[PDB]
């Protein structure tokens, strides 16, 4: 007797004869497992490893008529160590590379029963979900990363996943803190995937990540632009300075090569040229072309009124030719990766 | 009395029929879980990872009427494995990234019973906690980082939190010293946080991390300042030696950008410009203008002109220090008084 021992007797009578090996309505209709997620954070998005470390509260919600109880009006909140002694969905994420349930103090789990037998079960999870990235437009790119929720052991005629609350089934999207990206949107989808062993239900949660160019435009593009502008000062230094005309050109060439090298130890070994590599290619070609143009000012001045006039005219042209050509190239590049 | 068999049978009687799934006074008023912490060490603080690591002793107090016992005057201390047999709260840290209870020798947990049924449950934890920072004032910045504590499953209908001792509940922070920061202040908070599933109690601990400027003077400002003033040596080099001033200026440019990349080697790829970045931009601008001034001098020298070149050299010799002094004045006044 009593309002404590009565609840104890209720719970023990529920778990007396309960079979954990059988799904609800085993042999009957499928079990409709509603679910929804609350995003805690995305720790990082990695191009080197092609994955992103998502952390979240993951909830699941299903009927189980073997756990119905009467008289007690409370939504019993049982200690989470009971969840080891019940049937729980066999859900899993296909594209996850490595994940864990947070385990400090007591493993972070919630289980709550209701009088009409429906169960709520939730976890706090950190998952390193894979996300292959299309870096052809890097760093002006945007990425689609997804989490593929799926049941492993049970088929479409055993389980039926659905987003609980529909459109509102995922929250906390606006507390994701990524320096390099901003989540333009998130989208929720449900599907039936098919394997040799049968059809399965799948729920897809996807993010569309737009990059912020502020870091690169200041850290790698601005120095390249300035070094290219520096390379033009050779066209203001008088051609008598044969050693300095070389020194400037070769130093800018080596500096463009150096701006290149600082990237390669921080990115994957992708086999195709990216937008950043296109810009570095173009700027390096400008410095190399300035160096060649100095070489053919020197040649014509010393070796070949051709000894005077040709060199004078070429030097006078350069000071306007290179700025014009570089401006054209820069405009073409930016409109190529912005307007189309 | 504390006879061995009597204690054994008393404890067995306490646990005989004891139910794990139901919290103390189930259905009745909430469990008032008192919280207490003893900071052992803040192991690290990281801007690149936007987090800090903390090692601590974490204690919790509550009375479970089911564990009241009489005839024994001792506050019994039991082997920690009783924790798996008793009810213990589902407290967890919201903003931790990874944490673990220390398992050296045997898992670092404590349970001590008292005749009135009070349970002292304590355990030693190392936790990495997320704290993204306001780096806009990087070398002069001050940060607030917190440890958030909540019950995962039990709402305010079932559990209540309070700091046992009030403002005195956290200790050891007064002995924490860090290479990069100093704990100016720490403040304790209690509040209720409401989700769709209900109102959940929270306790939170916060630190005012003020950064120490000493490091960056040594590693950044000294090199940049010395290489900046080195660039003004060009004006002390006669323009008759046309090929040396270009080498000097371009060497200074190379050194400046080399110093800049070393910062990018130790920072998050954060978008916005930081005050350190602004200072580096100013120094690089002065170096760039120092080189461009020789280029302009060589233009004028070939376009009386020796006199013009010498006058420009003297005028730069005066003005570059003056302009840099104005820059330094504005920079420090702005980033100190703002």
């Amino acid at each position, epitope marked *: 007797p009593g309002n404590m021992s009565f609840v104890k007797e209720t719970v023990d009578k529920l778990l007396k004869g309960y079979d954990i090996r059988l799904r609800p309505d085993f042999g009957g209709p499928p079990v409709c497992v509603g679910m929804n997620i609350d995003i805690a954070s995305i720790d990082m998005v990695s191009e080197v490893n092609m994955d992103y470390t998502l952390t979240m509260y993951f909830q699941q919600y299903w009927r189980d008529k073997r756990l119905a109880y009467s008289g007690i009006p409370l939504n019993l909140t049982l200690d989470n160590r009971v969840a080891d002694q019940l049937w729980v969905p066999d859900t899993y994420f296909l594209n996850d590379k490595k994940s864990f349930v947070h385990g400090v103090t007591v493993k972070n789990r919630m289980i709550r029963l209701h009088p009409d037998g429906t169960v709520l079960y939730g976890l706090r999870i950190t998952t390193t979900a894979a996300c292959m990235m299309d870096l052809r437009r890097y760093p002006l790119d945007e990425q689609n990363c997804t989490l593929e929720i799926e049941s492993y052991g049970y088929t479409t005629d055993d389980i039926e996943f659905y987003w609980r609350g529909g459109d509102k089934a995922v929250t906390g999207v606006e507390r*994701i803190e990524l320096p390099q990206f901003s989540i333009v949107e998130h989208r929720l989808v449900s599907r039936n995937v098919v394997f040799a062993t049968g059809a399965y239900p799948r729920l897809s949660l996807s993010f569309r990540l737009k990059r912020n160019i502020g870091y690169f435009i200041l850290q790698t593009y601005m120095p390249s632009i300035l070094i290219t502008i520096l390379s033009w000062v050779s066209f203001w230094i008088n051609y008598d300075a044969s050693a300095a005309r070389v020194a400037l050109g070769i130093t800018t060439v080596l500096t463009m090569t150096t701006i290149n090298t600082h990237l390669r130890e921080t990115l994957p070994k992708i086999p195709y040229v990216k937008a950043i590599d296109m810009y570095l290619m173009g700027c390096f070609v400008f410095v190399f072309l300035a160096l060649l143009e100095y070489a053919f000012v020197n040649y014509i001045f010393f070796s070949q009124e051709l000894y005077k006039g040709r060199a004078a005219a070429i030097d006078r042209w350069s000071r306007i030719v290179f700025p014009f050509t570089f401006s054209l190239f820069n405009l073409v590049y930016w409109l190529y990766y912005v307007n189309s | 009395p504390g006879n061995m068999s009597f204690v054994k049978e008393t404890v067995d009687k306490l646990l005989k029929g004891y139910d794990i799934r139901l919290r103390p006074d189930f259905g009745g008023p909430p469990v008032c879980v008192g919280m207490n912490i003893d900071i052992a060490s803040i192991d690290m603080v990281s801007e690149v990872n936007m987090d800090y690591t903390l090692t601590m002793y974490f204690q919790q107090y509550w009375r479970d009427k089911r564990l009241a016992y009489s005839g024994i005057p001792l506050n019994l201390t039991l082997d920690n494995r009783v924790a798996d047999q008793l009810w213990v709260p589902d407290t967890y840290f919201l903003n931790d990234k990874k944490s673990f209870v220390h398992g050296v020798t045997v898992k670092n947990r404590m349970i001590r019973l008292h005749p009135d049924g009070t349970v002292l449950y304590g355990l030693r934890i190392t936790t990495t906690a997320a704290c993204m920072m306001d780096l806009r004032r990087y070398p002069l910045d001050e940060q607030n980082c917190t440890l958030e504590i909540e019950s995962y499953g039990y709402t305010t209908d079932d559990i209540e939190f309070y700091w046992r001792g009030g403002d005195k509940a956290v200790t050891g922070v007064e002995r924490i010293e860090l290479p990069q920061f100093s704990i100016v202040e720490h403040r304790l908070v209690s509040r*209720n946080v409401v989700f769709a599933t209900g109102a959940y109690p929270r306790l939170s601990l916060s630190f005012r991390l003020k950064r120490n400027i000493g490091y960056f003077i040594l590693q950044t400002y000294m090199p940049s300042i010395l290489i900046t003033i080195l660039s003004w040596v060009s004006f002390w080099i006669n323009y008759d030696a046309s090929a040396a001033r270009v080498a000097l200026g371009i060497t200074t440019v190379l050194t400046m950008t080399t110093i800049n990349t070393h910062l990018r080697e130790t920072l998050p790829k954060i978008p916005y410009v930081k005050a350190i970045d602004m200072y580096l931009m100013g120094c690089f601008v002065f170096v760039f203008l120092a080189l461009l001034e020789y280029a302009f001098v060589n233009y004028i020298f070939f376009s009386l002109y020796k006199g013009r070149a010498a006058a420009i050299d003297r005028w730069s010799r005066i003005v570059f220090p003056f302009t840099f002094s104005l820059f330094n004045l504005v920079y420090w006044l702005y980033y100190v008084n703002s």
Partner: nanobody
Amino acid sequence: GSLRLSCAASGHTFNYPIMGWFRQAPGKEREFVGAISWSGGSTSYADSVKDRFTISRDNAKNTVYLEMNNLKPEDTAVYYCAAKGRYSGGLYYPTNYDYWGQGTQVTV
């Protein structure tokens, strides 16, 4: 008609990365309207105003603006502005918002 509001924040706005717009009226509990994240722009709205109102953040002026488009009579309320902590809970619930504005009235 249509209307627009502005909420300017000062102080340690970094520790309060999210700002929410609520509203209240005599005989009504405080109602959520929308939210915005500093520097992120990722808004969320109450279903009652969704697709009418929008919220945006001017991060330089440290100010947020709510577009109160296509007014309807029931939109008559005092539109408190509020700020939310880094690790507080759900956005739809006023109790999670610490600092509150003076609550401009709106009338239709």
